[PDB]
Design a protein around this ligand. Sequence first.
Ligand SMILES: [Ca+2]
Length: 593
Amino acid sequence: KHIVVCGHITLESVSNFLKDFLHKDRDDVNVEIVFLHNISPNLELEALFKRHFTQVEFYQGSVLNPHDLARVKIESADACLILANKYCADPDAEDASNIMRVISIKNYHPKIRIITQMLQYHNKAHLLNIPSWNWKEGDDAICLAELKLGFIAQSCLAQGLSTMLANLFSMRSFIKIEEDTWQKYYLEGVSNEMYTEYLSSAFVGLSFPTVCELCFVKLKLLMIAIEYSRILINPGNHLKIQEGTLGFFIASDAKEVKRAFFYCKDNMDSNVKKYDSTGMFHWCAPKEIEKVILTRSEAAMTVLSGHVVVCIFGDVSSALIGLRNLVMPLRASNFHYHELKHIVFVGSIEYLKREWETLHNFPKVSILPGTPLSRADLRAVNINLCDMCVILSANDKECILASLNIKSMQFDSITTGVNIPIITELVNDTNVQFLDQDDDDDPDTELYLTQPFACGTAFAVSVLDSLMSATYFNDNILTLIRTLVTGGALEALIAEENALRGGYSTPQTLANRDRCRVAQLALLDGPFADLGDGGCYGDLFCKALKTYNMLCFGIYRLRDAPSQCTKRYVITNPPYEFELVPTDLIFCLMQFD
Ligand SMILES: [Ca+2]
C-alpha cells in the first residue's frame, strides 16, 4: 500500500512532507511514501532519509514518462501527490506543467486519486477539461492563491484567524510546557485538529444550535458545520439535522469525536445591480481605473478608519499575485453595504494596473500609487486608523522593512505605531525573527511557535504545505477551509468567464445573503460584560448560541494579562471552565441580519 509524491521534490519539501504525513498517519507501518523526481539522486543528502525513515523510496524518473509510472506502480498507489514549485517566477507555466503531469498520470491509469497544488485560481479551472478528473470521487486541487489570500482576508475580520486555521491542520506534538507563560495556553490551542464525523441518529430532527450545545456540554466537542450537497457553517434554529448528516468538529483527539456518532438518550433601487448573479458577493459596474486612483493629497484630504491597507511590492515584470482572491472574500454578500471595509492599495500603479482587470467589479476599492516605505503615503491613507494592514510581495526584506517602518512611526498626545494591526506575508520562515523586537528568536524553532505567528502577525505559504497531507487523509477538511475562507462557493460560472457577473436581486438570490461571517468580540460593552471577570468560556459560548445563534471558537488574549504592549495571541477552542478576562476578544461566527 503506497502513495507517489512527485513534482517539486526538495530536501526542504520532502522532509517537510514526511513530517506532516507521519504525524497524521495512524498506521504508518503499512504505507510506502514513494518519491519521484528527475534531478539526480543527491545520494549523500538523501540516504539519510532512507535512514531516518523505513517507508520511503526515491526513484530517478519523471511522471511524464509512462515507464516510470509503471516502475513506480501507479496502478496500485492509493493516491499520487503533485507538489508545486510555490515560488516559481512564471506561475502560469508552473501550473500548466502540473496539469500536464495530471494528464500523463490519468492517461496511464484514469482512476488514481490526484492531489495537486495550483498557484493560480484561473489555472485550477482547467483541470475540469480533463475527462478523468473527478472532484466528486476525490481528486483535489489545493489552490495556493485563493487560500493564501483567503486566510489573510478572514484575518482582516478577525486577526489571528489565519494562524488559528493553520494550526488546525498542521500536525504537531504537544511541548508539555509547564510554566505559566503565554506559550502555555497557546500550545494548548494548537493541539486541536479538525475532524469530520456523522451525527448520531439520536440527533435527527433537532436544531443545529441545540445539537451544538449538546456536543459542547456533554461531549466536549466543538461542532462548527454541517453537510447533507454544500457545507453550512454555524447555521441557525430553522435548520434541522436530518439523517446521514455529516458534522465538522474541532477537538484535541479523534477518539472523542466518535462520541458524536454514538449518542444515546423604491422603484429604481430594485433596478440597481448590487450583486453577482448568485447574490453571493457585492458587485458593481466596471469602474475605470482612473476613477479609483488617488493622489497623496486626495487621500490625505479624506480621513479613513476601519479600512484595509494593502501594501504591495512589485513592478511591471512581477508575476500577478491574483489579488481578486483577497478582495472577493471581503466583498461577500453576507456583509451589509455600509459595513464593508474600504480597501486601499499602496504600490506601483504599473503593477496594480494589471490586477485591475479582475478587480473592477468590487465596490470601495482604491489605489494610491506610492510605496509602502513612504511615511507620507502611509500617513495619507491613515494607516494608524486602519483595521488591518496587509503587506504582500509579488514574484522578504522589502516587506519586513515596510512592517518595521510602520511600527517606528509616530502619530497625532503622541502615539507610537507599534500597536497597529499588521499582517506580513513571508516567503522564508527563518526570517520571521525580524518582525518584532521583544520576542525570543531561534533560527530552527519551527514557525508556528514564534511570537509573530502565534499572534497572527505573520503568514507564510509554507503553512499551506501541510494542507497537502491533511486533504489526503480527509477530503472534506479542504472543502470546509475553502468554504469558510473564501466567503462562499458558484465555482462553475467563474470557471467559464473568469469574472463575476452582476445580476438583479431576486428574493432567491437575496436568500444567499443569509450565511454566517467571521467576527471578533469585545467583553467590555457587550451583553457579556459580566462574564468578563473570571467567567467561564463555556457559559459565554452557551449564552452566545442560545441567545444569538452565534458560535464561538476561541480567544484572542493579550500575551501580557503591568504593560503597554497590546499584542494578542490565539487560543483555539478552550475547555468549558476556561477563565475569561475582561480585555479578551472572542472568535465567533455571527448570523446575518
Ligand atoms: Ca525578533
